[PDB]
C-alpha cells in the first residue's frame, strides 16, 4: 500500500531517485523485488544518466531478475499506478516505520533467544543493547571581568575548556563552580570520573577555608591550622551538590541521569569531566551540545588534549558542535555570536590554589 503505489514518480520525474536514497537505501524493501529493484535503481543512475523505466528493465533483466523477479508484467502496472507524483516525500517519511518496524526487533529477538547463551559470561549482554538496541544573566560564569566580557552562563550552551597538562586544570574547577553553589539556589553537581570524587575534596575546601599549608591532606595538624575552617564547608553544605566517580561512562547516563537529576537537584550548571576519557572521544562532544538544552541549564565538559582549537582536534571533533571554546595555558575564549572574545590569563598563588582578576 505504502509500497504498492511508490515507484511511479521514478518514471514520472523520472530522476526521482534522489529523494528515494535520500533518507533511505536499497535495503528497506522486504518484498523480494523492490530491494534489488532499488539496487538496480541506483547503479543505473550511478553513471549517468539519469532515469527511465527501460534503463531499469535493463540491469534487472541483466541480473536476469526478470526471470528471477517476474517480468514486464509490473512495469505497466507501476507506470500506471501513481495518480500524482508529488507524494514522494513522504511516504519515505511514512514508509520508514514500515521497515523500521524491525530495527529493534532483530536486536531484541536476539537477546530473548540468547538467554540461551550468556551463562557463562552473563553480564556482557548489556552492551549489545547499548550498540544494537539503543541505536550573570544568567547563572554566573567564572570571573567578574569574565562576567562583563562574554556574559553568562545563559540558557543552553555546550562548553569545552581544553585544559593543558603540566600547567594546570585543578583550580579552574575551584573557580567556576566553587562560589556559585554557595550564594544563590541554582545549585550544581561535580563530575570527577577517573579519580574518586573524594580526593578532589582536598581541593576546594582547602580553597574556600583558605587552609592548605600545614597540611590538610594527611592527618593531625599542629595546634594551629584548625583556624580558618569556618569558611571551607561552612557554605558548601547549604547549597546542593552531587560529586561523582561512577565507571568509565558513555554519555547516555547523563541523559537518563539528567532526566532524574534535573528533578533531583536544583540546577545552575552541570560540571562534567574533561572531554578526553568518556567514550572514542569525538562522539561525546557531538551529543554534549543537546545536554544544555534538556535540563534547561548550560553544561560543562573540559579537555586534556599551545593552546588553540586544533589540539582538541588531534583527539576529537568539537568545532561543529561546541560553539564557545575557552582554554588554559590563558582562557582563550575565542568563539561566539554574543560579541566579546579576549586574551586573558590570571595570577596564581598555589599555597591555596587561588585565581586573581584585575
Amino acid at each position: 500500500e505504502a509500497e504498492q503505489a511508490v515507484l511511479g514518480a521514478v518514471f514520472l520525474d523520472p530522476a526521482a531517485l534522489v529523494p528515494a536514497s535520500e533518507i533511505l537505501i536499497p535495503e528497506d524493501f522486504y518484498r523480494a523485488a523492490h530491494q534489488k529493484i532499488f539496487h538496480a535503481m541506483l547503479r543505473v543512475a550511478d553513471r549517468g544518466e539519469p532515469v527511465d523505466l527501460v534503463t531499469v528493465t535493463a540491469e534487472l533483466a541483466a541480473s536476469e531478475q526478470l526471470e528471477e523477479i517476474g517480468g514486464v508484467s509490473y512495469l505497466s502496472e507501476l507506470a500506471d499506478a501513481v495518480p500524482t507524483a508529488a507524494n514522494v516525500e513522504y511516504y519515505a517519511r511514512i514508509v520508514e516505520e514500515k521497515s523500521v518496524l524491525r530495527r529493534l526487533i532483530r536486536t531484541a529477538t536476539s537477546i530473548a533467544q540468547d538467554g540461551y547463551t550468556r551463562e557463562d559470561e552473563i553480564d556482557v549482554l548489556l552492551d549489545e543493547a547499548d550498540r544494537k538496541i539503543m541505536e550573570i544573566t544568567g547563572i554566573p560564569t567564572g570571573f567578574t571581568e569574565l562576567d562583563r566580557m562574554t556574559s553568562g552562563f545563559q540558557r543552553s550552551d555546550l562548553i569545552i575548556v581544553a585544559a593543558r597538562p603540566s600547567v594546570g586544570k585543578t583550580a579552574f574547577a575551584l573557580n567556576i563552580a566553587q562560589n556559585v553553589a554557595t550564594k544563590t539556589n541554582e545549585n550544581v553537581a561535580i563530575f570527577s570520573l577517573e579519580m574518586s570524587a573524594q580526593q578532589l575534596v582536598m581541593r576546594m575546601l582547602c580553597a574556600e577555608g583558605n587552609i592548605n599549608a600545614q597540611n590538610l591532606r594527611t592527618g593531625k595538624l599542629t595546634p594551629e591550622d584548625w583556624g580558618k575552617l569556618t569558611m571551607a564547608m561552612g557554605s558548601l553544605s547549604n547549597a546542593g551538590i552531587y560529586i561523582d566517580d561512577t565507571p568509565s561512562i558513555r554519555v547516555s547516563d547523563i541523559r537518563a541521569k539528567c532526566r532524574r537529576l534535573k528533578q533531583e537537584s536544583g540546577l545552575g550548571m552541570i560540571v562534567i569531566d574533561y572531554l578526553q576519557l568518556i567514550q572514542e572521544v569525538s562522539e561525546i562532544s557531538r551529543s554534549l551540545k543537546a545536554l544544555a538544552r534538556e535540563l534547561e541549564v548550560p553544561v560543562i565538559a573540559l579537555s586534556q588534549l599551545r593552546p588553540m582549537m586544533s589540539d582538541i582536534r588531534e583527539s576529537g571533533s568539537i568545532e561543529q558542535d561546541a560553539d564557545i571554546v575557552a582554554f588554559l595555558y590563558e582562557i582563550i575564549i575565542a568563539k561566539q555570536r554574543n560579541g566579546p572574545v579576549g586574551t586573558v590569563q590570571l595570577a596564581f598563588i598555589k599555597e591555596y590554589n587561588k585565581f586573581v582578576n584585575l
Binding site: E1, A2, A5, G8, E77, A79, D80, A81, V82, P83, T84, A86
Partner: protein, 138 residues
C-alpha cells in the same frame, strides 16, 4: 489491479469527504466533466451538503446516500492519506480526470484508423499518426 488515473479521480472523493473548502473550487474546476458512470452522481450529492450546514465528517456525509453508495464510499474511507495538501497537488488533478477522455481519443478512432489497415491504405492512413502522436503534445 487498479490503474493510474482511477486513484486521481479518488484524489477528490476523499479530499472533499474531509474538507469542503477543498471542494468548492472543484465546482469551478471539475464540474463535471467527471469520468466514471457512477462518480458523477456522487459529486451531485457532495456540493448539495455545502448549503444546509451541519456536522461534516468522514462518515457523517456518506449516509445521504442510501445503500450501494456505501460499500463504495466507505471503501473510499478505508484509505491511507492526510489533510496537508499542496498548491501543485491542487494544480495536478486538473489534467488527470477530465483529460483521461483524451487517452480515449486514441482508441475509438483507431477502430477507424485500423480499419484503413485492412484496406491496405498506408498513404493517408499513415497521417492520422500526426493527428495522434503530435496531438498528445500539448
Amino acid at each position: 489491479l487498479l490503474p493510474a488515473f482511477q486513484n486521481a479521480e479518488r484524489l477528490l472523493l476523499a479530499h472533499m469527504m474531509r474538507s469542503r473548502d477543498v471542494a468548492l473550487v472543484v465546482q469551478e474546476r471539475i464540474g463535471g466533466r467527471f469520468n466514471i458512470e457512477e462518480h458523477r452522481a456522487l459529486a451531485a450529492y457532495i456540493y448539495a451538503f455545502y448549503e444546509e450546514g451541519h456536522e461534516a465528517d468522514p462518515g457523517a456525509l456518506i449516509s445521504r446516500i442510501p445503500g450501494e453508495l456505501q460499500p463504495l464510499a466507505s471503501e473510499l474511507s478505508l484509505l491511507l492519506i492526510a489533510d496537508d495538501v499542496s498548491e501543485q497537488e491542487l494544480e495536478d488533478y486538473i489534467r488527470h480526470v477530465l483529460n483521461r477522455p483524451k487517452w480515449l481519443m486514441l482508441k475509438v478512432k483507431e477502430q477507424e484508423k485500423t480499419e484503413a489497415e485492412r484496406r491496405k491504405d498506408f498513404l493517408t492512413a499513415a497521417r492520422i499518426a500526426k493527428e495522434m502522436i503530435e496531438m498528445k503534445k500539448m
